[PDB]
Amino acid sequence: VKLQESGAELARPGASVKMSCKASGYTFTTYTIHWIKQRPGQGLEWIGYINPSSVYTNYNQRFKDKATLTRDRSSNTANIHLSSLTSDDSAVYYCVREGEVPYWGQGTTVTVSSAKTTPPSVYPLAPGSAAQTNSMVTLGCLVKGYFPEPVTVTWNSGSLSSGVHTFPAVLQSDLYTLSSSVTVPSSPRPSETVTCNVAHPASSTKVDKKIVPRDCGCKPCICTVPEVSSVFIFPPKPKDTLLITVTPKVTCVVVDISKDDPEVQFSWFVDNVEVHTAQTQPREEQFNSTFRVVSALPIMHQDWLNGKEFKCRVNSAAFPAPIEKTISKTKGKPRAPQVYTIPPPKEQMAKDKVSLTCMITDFFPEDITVEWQSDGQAPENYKNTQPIMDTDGSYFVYSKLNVQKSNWEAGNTFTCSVLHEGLHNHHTEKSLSH
Amino acid sequence: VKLQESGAELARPGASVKMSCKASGYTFTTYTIHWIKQRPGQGLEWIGYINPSSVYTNYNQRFKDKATLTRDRSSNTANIHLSSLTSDDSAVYYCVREGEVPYWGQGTTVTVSSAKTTPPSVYPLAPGSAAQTNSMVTLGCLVKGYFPEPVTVTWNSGSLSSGVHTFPAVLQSDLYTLSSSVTVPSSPRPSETVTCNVAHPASSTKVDKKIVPRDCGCKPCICTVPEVSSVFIFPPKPKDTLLITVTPKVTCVVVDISKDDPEVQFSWFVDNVEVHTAQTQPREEQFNSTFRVVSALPIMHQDWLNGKEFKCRVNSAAFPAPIEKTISKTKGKPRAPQVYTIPPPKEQMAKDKVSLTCMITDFFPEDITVEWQSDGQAPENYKNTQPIMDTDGSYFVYSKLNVQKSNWEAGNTFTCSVLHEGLHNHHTEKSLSH
Amino acid sequence: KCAHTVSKSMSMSVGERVTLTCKASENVVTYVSWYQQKPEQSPKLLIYGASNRYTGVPDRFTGSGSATDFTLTISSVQAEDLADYHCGQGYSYPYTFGGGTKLEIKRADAAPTVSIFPPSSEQLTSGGASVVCFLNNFYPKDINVKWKIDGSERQNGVLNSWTDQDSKDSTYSMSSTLTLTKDEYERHNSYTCEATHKTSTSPIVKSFNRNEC
Amino acid sequence: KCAHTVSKSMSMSVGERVTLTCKASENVVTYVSWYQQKPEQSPKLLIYGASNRYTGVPDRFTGSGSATDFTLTISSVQAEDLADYHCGQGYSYPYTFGGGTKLEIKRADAAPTVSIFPPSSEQLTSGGASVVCFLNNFYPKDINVKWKIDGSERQNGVLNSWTDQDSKDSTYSMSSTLTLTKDEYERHNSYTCEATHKTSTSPIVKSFNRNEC
Ligand SMILES: *[C@@H]1O[C@H](CO[C@H]2O[C@@H](C)[C@@H](O)[C@@H](O)[C@@H]2O)[C@@H](O[C@H]2O[C@H](CO)[C@@H](O[C@@H]3O[C@H](CO[C@H]4O[C@H](CO)[C@@H](O)[C@H](O)[C@@H]4O[C@@H]4O[C@H](CO)[C@@H](O[C@@H]5O[C@H](CO)[C@H](O)[C@H](O)[C@H]5O)[C@H](O)[C@H]4NC(C)=O)[C@@H](O)[C@H](O[C@H]4O[C@H](CO)[C@@H](O)[C@H](O)[C@@H]4O[C@@H]4O[C@H](CO)[C@@H](O)[C@H](O)[C@H]4NC(C)=O)[C@@H]3O)[C@H](O)[C@H]2NC(C)=O)[C@H](O)[C@H]1NC(C)=O
Ligand SMILES: *[C@@H]1O[C@H](CO[C@H]2O[C@@H](C)[C@@H](O)[C@@H](O)[C@@H]2O)[C@@H](O[C@H]2O[C@H](CO)[C@@H](O[C@@H]3O[C@H](CO[C@H]4O[C@H](CO)[C@@H](O)[C@H](O)[C@@H]4O[C@@H]4O[C@H](CO)[C@@H](O[C@@H]5O[C@H](CO)[C@H](O)[C@H](O)[C@H]5O)[C@H](O)[C@H]4NC(C)=O)[C@@H](O)[C@H](O[C@H]4O[C@H](CO)[C@@H](O)[C@H](O)[C@@H]4O[C@@H]4O[C@H](CO)[C@@H](O)[C@H](O)[C@H]4NC(C)=O)[C@@H]3O)[C@H](O)[C@H]2NC(C)=O)[C@H](O)[C@H]1NC(C)=O
What we know:
Chain A is built from two helices and 29 strands. Chain A is mainly β. By secondary structure, chain C is mainly beta.
């Protein structure tokens, strides 16, 4: 028992278009059928009107001889041929049928407009952080500058539909724009994401905007004083913290020192405790134009290894504040490098020299050291790349050894030793031989 | 017509002390005078009692032969000599005069305690911000850990006294503590300050604590900066200067910009010539405390490749001189990387994933770029080490590709492409396959 | 040839007996037909002729009239009664419908729930800044939005879209964006989106001070 | 040698005729003397002997008694009547005063005015955290403080100091601090200082997040 209308969208002022309110659910040919319209927040305005056969065809004022109402009883359809379109014809057009005008269709909305079809822009609305209280972080999405209407805003691909509030679009100087809100629980947002799925039908612009939040953390006070000096604390070499007979010294040196800054007086803190360095003060070295005071304090292996801080408090006359900086460790749960060996490739076998790389991988942290060993002792040439974080979050390093064909082919055996904490007794090593 | 008592504060349990209820306002010598006490929230306990002359001297139980009541009629004064002080003697001691015990004095409070005179600590109580409504921001001050009593809390040096509520001190394990509140209008607080003035008489600790509101979060970094900015010109990415469809942009950006330095007006020089950038001026970005104006001017490949300079002249109001800096090339005679391929090692062949490295060596300069290609197109995971200068003066880089055994053994073929100027047509590539 | 509907809108609570008439310019001897047009959907023939309820229509609904007047009494409102209503002159072409009335339902006061949002990082880079301010779920629609650029000032460039009376919720949830210059925004810090409804005798505010978030 | 004062405390409103007696162990033939001891100050000889008001004493005050009993009627209370009162046996040493009564004045109910304060930034750095909670101006003193570490729990380490019946205000204004571990406090967030007086049948709460600046 139904009739629905077809095609009729945007049209240039004056031009024409034809809509066809299609029916079904009974005998068409025995019925009178009108067309009516309604403009923005307006009343109902009756327009054309044909009849069963096609005899009478009563139209009216605002569309006389400029809009034509056909019919095709045979294959159930009514029509309207909007011709001279005055901008004031913009509306949605229904299609009923007499008896007393009982069954109105859906409606198609024409828009008599000179404007150009302009695709919008999505602007995700994330809250200004604050505190996520009351368990309800309402979100929103902004669609601005689209012409004409309408647009379909759906949340998380229509999955979400608890409490959303899409907003009636508003015309603003030939440009439409509106927004939509979405009341959700606090917890799911940070975690399980929310997207703004929208499409401008008349443009075909399907878009999904993931509402990412900001970082209200106040970490903006990074500066650099050009007047007084600035100290830098450097970690001990991994080999020192590994080889037991070697004593791991931690340094901390100042830079911008003139012909006034006294001995500076260095003082360290191994976990809010203070201690006697080792008179570590080779100090002042007439550099580029300023000096440089060193403080190479040795410390127990196990201390760094267990993970202890290292403050380097210092006090001078010019200093506005007795500055200091720690240097604890690289954190986390230590991973041992798989460490492998790859002899010179096939392609490179006629060259004068060759390259055997030592491939250490997926370890943690970068605190590691590498050496090779031709014959049976410390060699040269070997160079080590710098620890770079691979896919999973691990690291890996290559160590290339250079030698001649005579040396290689003479099966002199070369060895790659790797020192990393996660290693068995803080060490491992593999060997290559022809 | 009055009598007031003197000295008698804290005393070790057992030891002694003498208080002297002093009089005036009449003839002393013709009067009988007692002493009475009252302990914490207790009743009145009569004690000694002398007489006019000094004849009768009726004492009582709790103080017989252990407290002595003297007199000195001549120079108007009564006395008490507390000797064996049992902790249960701690109280305030009055001093009346018979007729029927009409004129009691002020009272001195003894405290028989083994405790040590401990000075307190002031802790200002600022409200947890919130909204200052109802026009009455009540404040408070906390005095904790003081022995013995008492203490004098005064607000804004006794000036304020509208509605304050000082709180009865309470003993808590040999430690006293209490607080005081102060009802004031909202407006004056933020503005006209309020201090907490207090003193522990028996210690002489006069202290004034300012009642600042709860120190909030995001504080303006606003690091201070001197005489204008400094610009830095950065070279284009090697891949841009190599891939022909990509256009090699050379940048140059300023840093120390305040809320005054205008648009700066950037202008480039390609060999003492000047040219029109590409309105390359995304400019000013509110950074740490200062802005940052960018100037990403594109340029022909062959220009850089041939070796042309790049001045970045700029002029502002604050600028003492229209500064500019070029960025020509790396010079030297270009060496092409030998570029090889090494599939996953023997040792690592049972693992979940594997590593095929691309070994590019002895080239020049570091201006080079690398990509892999599983199947036959752009892949993921591959990471590139940073160019490091080998023995002879050349360079070399490793590029690791990560994949699974199924992928590898399935002979899907992977390819490593390398782009370096010294290459045939600025490019080369090798491939690995199982 | 011309017919007008009484009370452009009517706010009634359930069970309330609501009536609205339609006055016509001439005599139209009982040839009017009231149509019910619920939001976002096609009208429906409610009653025809004088009264005579069309099939599929509740006994509560009732028509009346003769020549220049035509009532439509509804003893008791409902959720099924939220919509626009307008008489349709059917005597003689051209046919002309009433102006239409909007029956808004009452449900006792309910304050808003504001939430101010600062312009996205993507918009700010293209010039421009849209400070949005959603004041959801509230009744009635009688409320005034007042923005404050920094200290205390409205300005122009405010877009205030409401929404229709929700069906189950029965509340308006108007938004109020505010567009302006990129750096004009950067010249200011604290953006206040004040709002004054009836519910709270005091104003409902919410804002922020332009910081890295 | 022993004398006891009737009603340890008495709550009367102005104009009320209040009386309190003092019973003695033996016969003390009219040798008692009532002393008035207003807060924070030395006692004052009110009446002596049987009655006979001491000079500088109001006609309202009145003594009576003989041997084992001794009254002290006061037709009409006042501001000048807030204090403790206790008879003093003066027949024969050792002299012994009553237990003392506390005349609290009535003024009709008045709810408290709570205000919770979070431990200062200075105390927290020395270890320890004192959450204070002032419940000022209220009548009567019949109230129960209940703290909540985060969710819902009292705990111990609470210090509840009252204050004496104000003279003009006539209200108690008890405070209630709460000391604890520095990080224990850091392990929790929302601190609730609930309070249940008579006035409001419902409880009076006030609290905070801890994430407030
Ligand atoms: C005039 O004075 C000086 C000196 O004159 C010369 O200066 C050199 C640089 C040339 O210019 C030369 O021409 C001049 O003649 C001059 O330079 C100095 O001032 C700048 C000011 O910025 C200062 O800058 C810092 O540089 C750091 C790098 O410096 C190290 O590394 C380089 C390169 O490898 C090396 O050349 C340096 O010598 C230095 O390396 C030291 O060297 C000592 C010996 O000299 C080694 O000693 C060993 O120590 C170990 C134990 O540690 C054992 O005891 C061994 O036995 C012993 O031999 C050290 O091992 C070795 N250290 C290392 C690590 O190799 C640079 O790191 C630093 O950057 C930090 O700060 C910035 C902010 O400014 C941050 O953004 C950075 O991120 C970084 O901070 C850290 O960052 C990490 C993350 O990356 C975080 O995790 C950390 O938390 C964070 N903080 C900390 C504390 O780590 C900064 O750039 C130079 O270092 C100075 N020069 C020297 C030689 O030190 C002045 O400019 C000039 N005056 C003026 C006005 O211009
Ligand atoms: C507040 O303002 C700023 C901004 O706030 C942030 O700053 C950062 C640094 C953090 O502190 C953060 O917390 C703050 O919020 C702040 O910092 C700035 O001031 C300092 C002042 O010294 C300035 O210092 C310089 O830093 C140079 C390094 O900067 C580059 O590299 C770092 C690390 O990789 C990177 O983080 C930076 O972003 C920057 O990298 C740029 O980034 C842009 C995009 O941001 C890329 O864009 C690409 O460009 C290419 C084309 O080039 C294509 O178009 C791409 O498509 C496009 O995307 C660039 O590619 C990328 N460049 C590079 C190279 O990767 C450092 O180089 C510089 O050192 C020179 O000067 C010293 C003397 O001072 C010399 O001694 C050095 O040697 C060097 O000079 C050159 O040296 C070589 C030899 O080594 C010579 O051969 C050359 O001749 C010689 N001259 C020249 C001209 O080359 C210097 O240290 C920071 O750079 C500023 N921050 C930024 C982001 O730029 C302020 O400190 C703060 N204010 C105050 C008062 O504190």
